[PDB]
Each structure stands twice: as C-alpha cells, then as structure tokens.
C-alpha cells in the first residue's frame, strides 16, 4: 500500500533549522534572500497552493516529453515550415530567439529561490521550477534546431541573446532586471507572479491556439506542453506577496509589482502586440491584441491584486489607453527598421487588413495609417529606399525600446526625459522614467544602443558599423515578410 | 547488474516435456497442431530470427502507444477529416471496416499457435503475436470511433464483419480460411508468412506514406506504428516452412503457400488495387498498383521462396499478367455496385486520370475505357440510372468477389465453372477453382451471396431485399465519392 500525498507532504518542506556554526545572515545573505527583517518562522507560513512531489514530477513530465517529441518526429518529414504563411515563420523565428536562452536563464532564477528563500515551501517548488525551465530552454532549442538548414535565422534561437542586436538587449534588460539580479523574494514577486502568472501563461495559451489555426501542430504541441508546466512554479509569487502584506511590507510589495508589470508590458508590446495585429493572417484572427489584453490579462491582474490586498498600480489608466497605441508604434518601429531584427517583419497594411485595424482601433487610419500611406506611395512609386532608415531611433533607457506613440492627425509622441548626475536619459513613458527614479543605482551606468553609438563604442560609427556590432549580416537581416506582395493591391 | 539477453533467452523457450498422464496426441490434437507426423524433438529446431522478451515487449510497446495516442489527441480538435479529399475519407472508411475486427480475430489465430504449436519458440512468439493483434484490433477501433458523429459509415469499423455485406463475406472468407480454421503450423505458413510477411507489411508501409502525402498524420502515425509490430510475429511462418521442407513435407508446405498467396492476392486486388490507381489523387501517386506489386511484393516472394527451398507457384505467370487487369475489374465492380459497399467509391476516370491509367497500363482506354465511356455519356446525358445496377454480378465461390476481367476491344472475361456433387460452382480464375479442387470438403456447402439469393434465403427476393440482408440503408450505402464532380470535365 501507498500513503496519500496529503499525509506526508508537509514533511517534504519541514526543512528549516536554526544555524549555529554560521549565522542566519551568513547562511541567508539579505541581498540573495530578501527576507526583509521578517523572521524565518513567519516565512514558514508560505503555503504553495499547487503541490507536487518528486515521483509525481518525473512520471508526469516523462509523459509530457514523450508526447511533444513524438509529435515532432511524426510531422518532421512533411516539413510544414516550408509552406507556412511567412508571417507565421517569422512569428516562430522571433519567438525562439527572444525566449529560448531566457527560459534557460530562468532556471538560475529558480535556483536563486531554491537556495535562498527562507520559506521551505518555496525552496522545493523552485527546485521543480528549476527543472521546468531546464526543460523549456532545452526543448525550445531542440525544436528550432530542425530548421538550421533552411535559413541562418534559425541559428538565432541559440545566438540571439549572445548578441547586441537591439531586441536582445531589450530582452536581457527585462529579464536580468526581473529575475537574475534580485533577491529570492523579489524574484518570486517580479517573475513568477507579475510576469509568468500575469502574462506568459495566457500568452502561451494564445500562441498555441494561433499555432493550431495556422496548421503548425508541431509548434502548437510544443507551446501547449510548455504551458502546462507554468502554474506549478508560476504560483510562487502569491504566497510571498501574502507574507509581505501580512507583515508590514504592503508598499515594498506594491512597488515590485508596479515595476514588474510595466516592464513586462513594454516587452510584451513589441513581442506579442505586433504579431497578433499584423503577422497573423486576417482570417486567422480571433480578436485584437487590445481585446486579448483586456479579456485575458487585465481583468486577471485586477482579480489577483484585489485578493491579495494590493491596489491597481498608479499607471493603470495610462496602461489602458496605451493599448490603443503602443504596439502599433512597436510594429512600425520593427518593420521600418526591419534590417535590424532577425526575422522578416510582416507589414500587415493591405486594404482588408486596414479596415480590420480600423474596426479594432477607431482612428487608426487617421493616425497610424498616415505613416503607412507614405510608406505605401513610396513603394508603389518605385522609391523603396525611403522605407528603410538612415538613422537610429531614440531608445528608451528603461525598456530599451524605441520611443514612439500616436502619429498622424492625433500626434502625441512624447519623451519623458530626465537629467541625473550630468547625463540626460530618455524614457518612452511616465512609468519607464519612474522605474529609474525609484531605484537609480540599479540602472545609472547602463547604456542603451544609442548611448553606445554616441560614445564611440560602435565603430565604424555608421549604420553598417551598428550592423556588425549587433552581429547581423545579409541573410539574417530582416526584410518584408511577404516580399512586398501586399503592394500590388495599391499597384 | 543485468544479464545480456543472449545468455538466458533459450531458457524462455525450453518448455517442452514428455506428457505421461495424458498422451501427446491428446495434449496436441493433430487437427489443432498440424504436427504432421514430425516429432516434438524435430519441432524444437524452430528458431525465430527476431527475438524479444516480456520486459522488452511491455516497455517498447508502452512507448509506441504513448506516441500514437498523443499524436491523435494533439490533432483531434483540428478535425483534418472534415476537409480531406473524399477518396481519402473513403480509403479510411473501407480500411477500418475491412480490417479492424479481422485484426482482432488474428489474436485468436495467434492464440491457436500459442497453445498448439509443438515448437516452443513458436508458442512464445505467438503469445506476443496474440498481444500484437489485441493492440491492432483495439487501436483500429479507438481511432475511427473519433468520427462516429460525422457519418454512420464510421460505425462500420465495428459493424462490417458482423454483416452479410458482400465485402465482409469476402474478408471472412479469406481470414477464416487462412487463420481461424486451420491447425497451428498451417496458420504459421498461411497467415504470418504468405499474408502478413508477403502482403500486409509492405501494404501498411505504402498506406502510411499515402496517408502522409494526403496530409493525414493521425492516420499516417496509426498505420506506421502498427506496421512496426508486424515482423515480430509475421516471422513465425518461415521457421515452420524450414522444418517442413527439411523433413519430407516440401509438397504440403508448397500447397499451403500456393493457396495462401492466391487467396491473399484476390482480396488484395479489391482492397488495395482500386485505392492506389483510383482513390488517391493523380498528383499524389508515386507509382501504379502494378508497379507497387512488382517492386514491393513479387520480387520478395521469389526471394523468400528461393531461400526456403520452395518453387514459384504454378500460377505465377498468370498472376503477372493479371496485374494489368484484375483490380481494374474489382474497381469497376465496386464503383458500379457502389450502393452495396459502406464507403463512397471514387470513379477516378477524369481525362487526366485516364492518360495516367493509359501510361501505367497501355491498352486501358481501348478496354476498361470502353465501359467507362458508356458510364460517362450516360452521366453527361442526364441518364444516371444506367450507372447503377438492376441485378447481382456472378460471385466467385472461392474469393467471394465478382467474376470480372478485361472488357472492350480485348474482351477476355472467363468463368472457371465446376460441377461437383450435382451443384454448379463459379470461379473467377483457374487458381480459385483449383483451391476448391485440392480440398473440396472445406468449401463444399458454403454458399456465396448469389447462391443465397437464388435459394430463397434473401427475402424479399429483390435488390431492396438484398440490401437489408446486407444491413445497408441510405446513409451508409455508397455513392460516387466526388459527387460526380468529375463529370463536368465532359460537360
């Protein structure tokens, strides 16, 4: 006979002791634990709501890989990827490059909590968390590797985060901030709660649906499998927030959440936004990126925050408005500067696409449309060179993303500048600037790509220089995904 | 540490003993064992060339199902089957109905050898054989069951072999002859060697390729998985033939092979033939059914027979010629009598289809084309009723398939009639008639569908009567697969 889990579970996480040959602070250094003056005993209240034990883990996850990997081997020799919509191929090439190594990096973050959390529950869950991201990183390398002979862009699944291409900088800027350079409690809040529970879970759901809809079942299976691992470790932040709120730190807890969500949203608005509203074919589109944000992301956050005794962040209304705008900026930025990324951006401004854009976002043609008008005439009128850039946009010093917003008839592009210790910083929103102001020691001597350019760190100090600096050469440098085929619609 | 298989394998099959409380003949009754006067000791020479042991089996086959079933669950909600070529859907509906319950029946056949073989090697292999067909039957029910709400034709995966529809009779006529009603040695020869090793292995390969090519990966995975189980038990016949030849029974061994192959070929020519040359789309076609027969079936048989000290069967040249003909007859029969089967036959005589037919089979339009000409005019000229029958074709008393052959300008349709004990039998070939003559006690009072009709066993004694007798009602009764859409090509 076997015990029922409930009967012996607690003993798995009954592992705290009172050190004696070294001191608590030496065993649990504050910079790594973030115990915040709250006692060991009070951290022992930490109670993960989703429980699992080693034998369950290896059994359940053995089956998950069996599936995922059999699906891939079964579908490999049909090579779906050779005949997929190219906005789809692009979606995939972007995903792998932006995520694979960061997923792997996430295991270190988990390892952070696994050693340094004073909550024994957290330490164990994070060990499983640590295994989870070992998987994600691993599988999200194994999968793209099937395509390395089709194009060098697939090498970026590995290489991207080893480069200074601007998107990779933006990714690392997010991740190192959220999960690599903070204490254990912090990571539990900023990564597992704010980012994984708040964004990347629901994103992965949508991404799997879209993969399916596109006829890519290898990828649909991949993504959906990974997604089933999420809540197991994504849960870790909640209990931490409970302890913090119940013990005199509601504000500190608030501040981390405020920072973690804004930073998540910015990165989300360049990675998911453009894909939803521009790369996925018109007839494959269930809802707008704004619709998806409001349904599956925003309400949940409010629900979570309310149940935890926290408030909506100060910037929440701004964030609402920004759903009409930010990602359209991000997409225009990416498309216009398309030689600077490692996938082919899809324009997504055909007439039919444009009425859809106009429906989901009333005022779009009156604003975003204007820029695209000029892009379009230029392409009709055999002047394609005015659709590629001769300079570098202003980079936000927080999110490391272009500073961009409404154009056209409702022009509202702003820079939330800040002078600090005789250096001028640039910020793409009030919130990005605020993130620096609450903790400047943390960002102060970081330099964005533009700073580097300006300081003589990029040599030759021209565009071709910036291209080598960013490890990009023809063949990975991105161009229009449908090879301009949407232009024929205007002649 | 573990032993290497080689070291202890023999002990798994060191299981014969000399009975004492009952007699050998009582323990191994000749009608069930077919020991043929050859001693127990001499049967112990039986040495299966592919070896496996219980722990290997359950481990390896656990993984096979994990895969196959995950592929199905992953692809289910996309419902490929709703948008597949209908010649494909038909191919599937025919396959399941003709094969599923017979596969399950094959486990009894295996069980036959597992109890009654005097070769201990055979008894064990047949136990694994018995498990194999338990799988095949089971999985080939689980899979079609996903479609029961799409059409009642899918119920035939279960129901077919419980009916008196003419194809089901033809199937059971083959299988009960080959594997259900013969002694153990016999089954090892006629089923595992002649049928499984000789036909159904290579067929399954082709069927999986075709499934893939059609964009049906659930089915491609299904078929190819089953196929990997084949040689494990398909091998059983060879060693039996060796023992028989080495011991004074070359002729008996010959005769079984001769019978088993012809009977296999006839059934093959109505099940696989039409599908290859008519249901699969023109541009999906790798080679002709005749090409496939010569490459993957015939040469192998000659190789097998030569290595075993046996001769090519007496009818071999006839069989060669018949590759130009038989299946075209079978397909015309099936199509013309399409309300009498449970899938929609695909005509496959569009102009482009017809030049392909003419290339693979020079003389086709001059012969088979003639009938199709008349069918075609009739359909152009708004007389569709002359393309459905008012009588029942002559059934062969061996193969229970229509008696049919070349039409048109090279007319060569023959009946190999035989009067025996004051009853007249009809036979679709010299070989079918010969199968009866070498062993008439085995077929004598069997009645084909036509015999039944003629004797008053089908009531009402009209076509609608024969339809109920065969359990067929509108909704499963078959019609033209592409709903006549190929007629537009002629106006």
């Amino acid at each position: 006979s076997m015990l029922k889990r409930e009967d012996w579970y607690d003993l798995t996480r009954t592992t705290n002791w009172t050190p004696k040959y070294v001191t608590e602070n030496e065993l649990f250094p504050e910079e790594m634990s973030g115990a915040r003056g709250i006692s060991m005993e009070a951290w022992e209240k930490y109670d993960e709501p989703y429980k699992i034990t080693y034998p369950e883990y290896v059994s359940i996850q053995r089956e998950k890989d069996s599936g995922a990997y059999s699906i891939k081997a079964a579908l490999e020799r049909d090579g779906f990827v050779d005949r997929a919509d190219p906005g789809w191929v692009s979606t995939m090439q972007l995903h792998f490059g932006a995520i694979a190594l960061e997923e792997y990096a996430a295991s270190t973050a988990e390892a952070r909590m696994a050693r340094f959390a004073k909550a024994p529950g957290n330490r164990n869950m994070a060990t499983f968390g640590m295994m989870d991201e070992n998987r994600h990183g691993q599988i999200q390398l194994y999968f793209p590797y099937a395509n390395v002979k089709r194009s060098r862009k697939w090498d970026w699944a590995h290489k991207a985060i080893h480069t200074n291409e601007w998107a990779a900088i933006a990714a690392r800027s997010f991740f190192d901030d959220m999960m690599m350079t903070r204490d254990s409690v912090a990571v539990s809040i900023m990564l597992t709660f704010a980012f994984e529970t708040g964004f990347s879970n629901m994103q992965f759901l949508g991404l799997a649906a879209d993969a399916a809809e596109a006829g890519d079942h290898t990828f649909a299976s991949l993504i959906s499998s990974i997604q089933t691992d999420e809540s197991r470790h994504a849960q870790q932040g909640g209990p931490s927030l409970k302890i913090l709120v119940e013990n005199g730190k509601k504000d500190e807890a608030q501040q981390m959440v405020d920072v973690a969500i804004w930073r998540s949203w910015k990165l989300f608005s360049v990675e998911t936004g453009p894909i939803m509203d521009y790369y996925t074919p018109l007839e494959s589109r269930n809802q707008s990126f704004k619709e998806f944000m409001l349904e599956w992301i925003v309400a949940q956050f409010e629900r979570q925050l309310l149940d935890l005794g926290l408030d909506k962040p100060w910037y929440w209304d701004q964030f609402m408005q920004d759903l009409d705008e930010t990602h359209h900026g991000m997409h225009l930025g990416v498309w216009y500067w398309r030689p600077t990324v490692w996938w082919d951006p899809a324009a997504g401004v055909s007439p039919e696409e444009r009425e859809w854009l106009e429906e989901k976002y009333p005022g779009w043609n009156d604003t975003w449309g204007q820029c695209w008008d000029v892009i379009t005439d230029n392409l009709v009128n055999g002047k394609p060179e005015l659709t590629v850039p001769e300079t570098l946009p202003t980079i936000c010093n927080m999110c490391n993303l272009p500073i961009a917003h409404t154009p056209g008839n409702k022009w509202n592009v702003k820079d939330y500048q800040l002078e600090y210790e005789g250096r001028l910083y640039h910020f793409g929103s009030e919130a990005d600037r605020w993130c620096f102001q609450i903790d400047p020691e943390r960002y102060k001597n970081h330099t964005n790509l533009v700073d580097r350019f300006l300081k003589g760190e990029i040599q030759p100090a021209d565009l071709a220089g910036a291209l080598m600096y960013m490890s990009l050469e023809p063949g990975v440098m991105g161009d229009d995904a449908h090879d301009y085929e949407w232009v024929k619609a205007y002649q | 540490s573990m032993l290497k298989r080689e070291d202890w394998y023999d002990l798994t099959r060191t299981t014969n003993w000399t009975p004492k409380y009952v007699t050998e003949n009582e323990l191994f009754p000749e009608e069930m064992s077919g020991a043929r006067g050859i001693s127990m000791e001499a049967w112990e020479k039986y040495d299966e060339p592919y070896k496996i042991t219980y722990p290997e089996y359950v481990s390896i086959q656990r993984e096979k199902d994990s895969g196959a079933y995950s592929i199905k669950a992953a692809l289910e909600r996309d419902g490929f089957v709703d948008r597949a070529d209908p010649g494909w859907v038909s191919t599937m509906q025919l396959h399941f109905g003709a094969i599923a319950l017979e596969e399950y029946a094959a486990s009894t056949a295996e069980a036959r050898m597992a109890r009654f073989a005097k070769a201990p090697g055979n008894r064990n292999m047949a136990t694994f054989g018995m498990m194999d067909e338990n799988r095949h039957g089971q999985i080939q029910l689980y899979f079609p069951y996903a479609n029961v709400k799409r059409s009642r034709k899918w119920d035939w995966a279960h129901k077919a072999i419980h009916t008196n529809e003419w194809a089901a009779i033809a199937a059971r006529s083959f299988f009960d002859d080959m594997m259900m009603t013969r002694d153990s040695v016999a089954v090892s020869i006629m089923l595992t060697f002649a049928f499984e090793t000789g036909f159904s292995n290579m067929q399954f390969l082709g069927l999986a390729a075709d499934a893939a090519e059609a964009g049906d990966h659930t089915f491609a995975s299904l078929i190819s998985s089953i196929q990997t189980d084949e040689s494990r038990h398909a091998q059983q016949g060879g060693p039996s033939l060796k023992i028989l030849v080495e011991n004074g029974k070359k002729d008996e061994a010959q005769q079984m092979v001769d019978v088993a192959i012809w009977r296999s070929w006839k059934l093959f020519s109505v099940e696989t033939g039409p599908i290859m040359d008519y249901y699969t789309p023109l541009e999906s076609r790798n080679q002709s059914f005749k090409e496939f027969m010569l490459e993957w079936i015939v040469a192998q048989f000659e190789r097998q027979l030569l290595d075993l000290g046996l001769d090519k069967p007496w009818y071999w040249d006839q069989f060669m010629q018949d590759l130009d003909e038989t299946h075209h007859g079978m397909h015309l029969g099936v199509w013309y009598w399409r309300p009498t089967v449970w899938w929609d036959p695909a005509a496959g005589v569009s102009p482009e289809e017809r030049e392909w037919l003419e290339e693979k089979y020079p003389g086709w339009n001059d012969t088979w084309g003639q009938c199709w000409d008349v069918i075609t005019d009739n359909l152009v000229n708004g007389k569709p009723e002359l393309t459905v029958p008012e009588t029942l074709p002559t059934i062969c008393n061996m193969c229970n398939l229509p008696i049919a052959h070349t039409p048109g300008n090279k007319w060569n349709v023959k009946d190999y009639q035989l009067e025996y004990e004051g009853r007249l039998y009809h036979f679709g070939s010299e070989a079918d008639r010969w199968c009866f003559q070498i062993d008439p006690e085995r077929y004598k009072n069997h009645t084909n569908l036509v015999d039944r009709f003629l004797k008053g066993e089908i009531q009402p004694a009209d076509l609608a009567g024969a339809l109920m007798y065969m359990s067929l009602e509108p909704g499963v009764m078959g019609d033209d697969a592409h709903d006549y859409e190929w007629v537009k090509a002629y106006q």
Partner: protein, 84 residues
Amino acid sequence: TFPIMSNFERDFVIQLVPVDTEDTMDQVAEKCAYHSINRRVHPQPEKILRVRRHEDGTLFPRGMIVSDAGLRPTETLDIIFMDN
C-alpha cells in the same frame, strides 16, 4: 423461370440473369443486353446477338428455347455479336 449467368461481350463482368424456360435464344439475349447494352457496352445495331454455352463454346440457334438447351441451372452463357 431459370437463372443463368450472362457473360456479355465487351462487358467486364458476368451477371445473374433470370430468364424463362420458354424463352428463345433471341429473348435470352434481350434480357441479358438490358444489363450490359447502354450500361457498359455500346449497341451494335448492324449486328445480331447470339447465345453460346460458355463452358464448351457451343452456339445455340436464335430460335431454340431454353427448355431444349440442356442447361444446368445457373449456367454461364456467352452473349456475343454476330452478323448471322
């Protein structure tokens, strides 16, 4: 009422045809044609349909009746095109 098996010329398949013991070969031929002519075989109206016993090639005159033919029930009959 007598079952025979029709092997119609230039068709691909032998069929069950009920005939009458009283029928003439001519009338056998007609009853057969019904199931072959204009279904899978082209008419030949410069031609005459003859009836021969399939097993041995024996040609029956147009005018003889089934009763007198020496036929085994279910006997196969070739139905061929001729000028006489």
